[PDB]
Amino acid sequence: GLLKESMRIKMYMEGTVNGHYFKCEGEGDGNPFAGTQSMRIHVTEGAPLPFAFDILAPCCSKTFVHHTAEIPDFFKQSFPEGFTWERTTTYEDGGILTAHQDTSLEGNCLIYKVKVHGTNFPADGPVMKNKSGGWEPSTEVVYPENGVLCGRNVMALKVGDRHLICHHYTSYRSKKAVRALTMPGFHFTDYRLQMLRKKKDEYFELYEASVARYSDLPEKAN
Amino acid sequence: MAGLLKESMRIKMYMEGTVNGHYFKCEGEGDGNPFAGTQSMRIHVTEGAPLPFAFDILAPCCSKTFVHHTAEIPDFFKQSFPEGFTWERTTTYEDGGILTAHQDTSLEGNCLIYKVKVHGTNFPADGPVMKNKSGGWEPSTEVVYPENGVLCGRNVMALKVGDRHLICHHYTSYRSKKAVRALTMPGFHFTDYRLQMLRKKKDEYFELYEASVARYSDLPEKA
Amino acid sequence: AGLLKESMRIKMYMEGTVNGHYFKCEGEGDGNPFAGTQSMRIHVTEGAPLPFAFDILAPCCSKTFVHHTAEIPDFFKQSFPEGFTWERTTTYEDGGILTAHQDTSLEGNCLIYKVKVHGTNFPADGPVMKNKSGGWEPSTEVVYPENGVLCGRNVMALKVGDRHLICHHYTSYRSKKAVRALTMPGFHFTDYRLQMLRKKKDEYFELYEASVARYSDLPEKAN
Amino acid sequence: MAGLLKESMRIKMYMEGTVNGHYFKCEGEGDGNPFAGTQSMRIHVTEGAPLPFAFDILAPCCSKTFVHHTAEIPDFFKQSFPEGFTWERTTTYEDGGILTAHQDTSLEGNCLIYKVKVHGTNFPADGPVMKNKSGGWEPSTEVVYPENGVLCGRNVMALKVGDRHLICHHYTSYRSKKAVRALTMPGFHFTDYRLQMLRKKKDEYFELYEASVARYSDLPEKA
Ligand SMILES: [Cl-]
């Protein structure tokens, strides 16, 4: 078992949102097979963040997805080489956040290097006014395109009693040769990302559960 | 299930529109169980046949009265009757197509009446839609949430094209024709769909089957 | 030579929905096709008072009236007597999307416009739905051929107090003449200044527009 | 024009990034007249040569100090010195590619120093960028407007591919490193550009020339 039922996580993230530079460091832990994980994040440069960390939380880990129904596991198959991902997230009120990430494995420790770039968040919107209240659960659509795994997702940011919708466009690339990977079929991945604590716009505690699965609806023969 | 909506309902659908300058009209005859969330429909292109594009793009225009609602989720669509409801959609395809739709849903005794108008443009002339090379839809999960008396939907849809998929994006709004005070809005939730094309002939006759369920996420919440 | 005159009549029939709100309106206008200037008076006959800013409909209301400089071939004036159509998607950076399609025909000295609009997802508290906008800045469209179809892209800026809300035009213009019967222009620009001169009770609007097709004014270097 | 900024300035540029996973670094030396709005630059690819993609997508990353300002439009960029300014851009290509850039502009005596970091992805493997089959940019017209103390820009760019064009869209923000209270913001205006690639060798050496002018619309405004 190259992955253990308890893993450490170390994350290094930097970037800008509406021109505001930040750097933070995360340390976390999780069970890759149960699909559960947590992370503590400290903003070491650019604190206090003048925007909602909610927009950075989904940049902070698909080794920790519980795979059901024998769905091949693109991410766990990628080790020891690891994998990368790229995402564009569009917010319906104008914000755009791109991110790219490198995932590597050193012994018991997964290591994440993330670069983010957010632009055009409206100055009076809930992101820049820092008035959001976490994410709803979501369900990602996942499917192969050659040797690359593609993802699409609708996410809903809680803003008071209403929602601000954004759209995920993600590509996951293995550092293993496509020859040595068994790609999944089309499937879904459920997520529930929770922010358990936040302090002074410089400290955040995350928890995430994730499950890969097929549609629950029966398929009518004909 | 003994009142305005019963365990077996009939459906009549009238659709017309233009896609990439190609005019057509369709009529649908269908039936289903609105409480079990299952339904079928037989569609005949009555004008503009053979369709010079994949009927797949029109199938999701062809019925949310037939959603099985779990976990006591308020049912926006069933609550709307006898008056009924309307819906509108903008769909964007990642290779350029854009399809817009207006729909009205009315009741006539045991029969639901659907009146749909669609407009599509910018579908690539050599893409799978205009070349009629798609292979039906994958199942999907819509995000459903209220916004000031209106029900909103968002969905990622995946059209099968050989071994690959072409992605499109639904932006849907649902409006009741009942007075606003008489409706109990749901909260944020999901609706699963599986839309299947069971028969097609001559780019003129199509047969659909659909199951849908409204529900919350199955994932536990960490306290 | 001929067909179009120094003064033309314009009649416009427009209908559609914005955020579910249906409206119909009728315009009568006039202009000088060769000077590139025109005006229109618009009466909302159904759905008044409009619960949204008519600014978003004003660019749906006429490219026969573009002054063509530097001998740029005139796709629109060449299209008569047959006429032409256009299709546009406009995305607003705060979420709105407005599609429209239009038919342009010519009868005597009267240009006849038939427009259909479908706007969705305008934010309920944004300046469009709150009716708080203050007209358009001038703009410069990019215009270029793609196999007999004329394409257009434009950045538009809606004035909201002392700020701007940006939207993006994606336009396609199609002639009803055969491809062989008309000379396509090359890549070029079209300047616009659309002004709303009067508005009353969200049911009556007066437009004025000036437009010029031209090349970049910047010199071209050596190589 | 005898103080910090003179009629002849030098430029040194440092650029690095990855496009579709391909790492590169390049260095530029340039010069120009910031008041007349003309400049040139000779670029060497120092890492990752030969570039496996069209350098055209990087040329607009390679200088707003050299904009000729007309009609007394306040000059956000020249006002920022000696401290300088930064800019950021997101560019979306209609065939799928996306390019992001961060840039810092500083002053060293008579030399402007540019530090650029770029990230591009989703360019189609068979597209004109990754297959290196593009042919330079058309001229363009940027829309420039203030939002608080930040200058915003939007632009439609048209890359020549044979006799056709691939469109992309600029979303640019410009931020001054001089104190906010020391800045006179412009109003809404336009900036014309013409960026020309006068020389290229072995996908490793490139020569650019650029002219740009800030102005208002040429169209008269109505009573
Ligand atoms: Cl706190």
DSSP string, chain A: --S-SSEEEEEEEEEEETTEEEEEEEEEEEETTTTEEEEEEEEEESPSPSS-GGGTGGG--TTS-EE-TT---TTGGGTTT-EEEEEEEEETTS-EEEEEEEEEEETTEEEEEEEEEEE---TTSHHHHT----BPPEEEEEEEETTEEEEEEEEEEEETTEEEEEEEEEEEEESS-GGG-----SEEEEEEEEEEEEETTTEEEEEEEEEEE--SS-----
Centre of ligand 1 from the C-alpha of residue D118, in Å: 35
**Interchain CB distance below 8 Å, C138 and D217:** yes
The chains in contact with chain C, meaning 3 or more Cβ pairs closer than 8 Å, are: A, B, D
Report strand pairing: A148-159 vs A162-174: antiparallel
Q: What is the distance, to the nearest Å, from the Cα of residue D29 to the centroid of all Cα atoms in its chain?
A: 15
**Interchain CB distance below 8 Å, B192 and A211:** no
Centre of ligand 1 from the C-alpha of residue A194, in Å: 17
- Between B86, B98, B171, which is nearest C89 by CB? B98
What is the gyration radius of the CA atoms in chain C, in angstroms? 17
Centre of ligand 1 from the C-alpha of residue A121, in Å: 23
Q: Which of D156, D173, D185, D201 best probes binding to C when mutated, by most C CB atoms within 10 angstroms?
A: D156
Report the gap between the CA of C22 and the closest CA in chain D (Å): 32
- Identify the structural domains of chain A with CATH numbers, from first to last: 1-222 (2.40.155.10)
Report the gap between the CA of B201 and the closest CA in chain A (Å): 15
Chain A residues whose CB is inside 8 A of the D102 CB are 16, 117
> Rounded to whole angstroms, what are the CA distances from D22 to A15, C95, C140, D48?
20, 34, 36, 7
- Between C155, C191, C222, which is nearest D217 by CB? C191
Centre of ligand 1 from the C-alpha of residue A166, in Å: 26
Q: What b/e readout covers A25-50, taking b as 16+ CB neighbours within 10 angstroms?
A: ebebbbebbebbbbbbbebeebeebe
Using beta carbons and an 8 Å cutoff, which residues of C are at the interface with A? 93-95, 121, 123
Tokens of B86: 């309307």
Q: What is the distance, to the nearest Å, from the Cα of residue D82 to the centroid of all Cα atoms in its chain?
A: 20
Q: Which residues contact B215 (CB under 8 A, 6 or more apart)?
A: B70, B71, B73, B189, B190, B191, B192
Using beta carbons and an 8 Å cutoff, which residues of D are at the interface with A? 21, 86, 88, 90, 98, 100, 102, 119, 121-122, 147-148, 150, 171, 173, 175
Q: Which technique was the structure solved with, according to the deposited record?
A: X-ray
Report the gap between the CA of B117 and the closest CA in chain C (Å): 11
Q: What b/e readout covers D146-180, taking b as 16+ CB neighbours within 10 angstroms?
A: bbeebbbbbbbbbbbbeeebbbbbbbbbbbbeeee
In whole angstroms, give the CA distance from residue A132 to residue A54: 7
Centre of ligand 1 from the C-alpha of residue A51, in Å: 14
In whole angstroms, give the CA distance from residue C179 to residue C149: 9
**Interchain CB distance below 8 Å, C124 and B148:** yes
Using beta carbons and an 8 Å cutoff, which residues of C are at the interface with B? 17, 19-20, 87, 89, 97, 99, 101, 116, 118, 120-121, 124, 170, 172, 174
Which one, of C152, C154, C150, lies nearest residue C194 by Cα?
C154
Between A and B, how many CB-CB pairs are < 8 A? Answer: 83
The chains in contact with chain B, meaning 3 or more Cβ pairs closer than 8 Å, are: A, C
- Nearest-CA residue of chain D relative to C145? D164
Q: Which residues contact A16 (CB under 8 A, 6 or more apart)?
A: A22, A116, A117, A118, D88, D102
In whole angstroms, give the CA distance from residue C120 to residue C194: 23
Contact A191, A210 (CB under 8 A): yes
Chain A residues whose CB is inside 8 A of the C158 CB are none
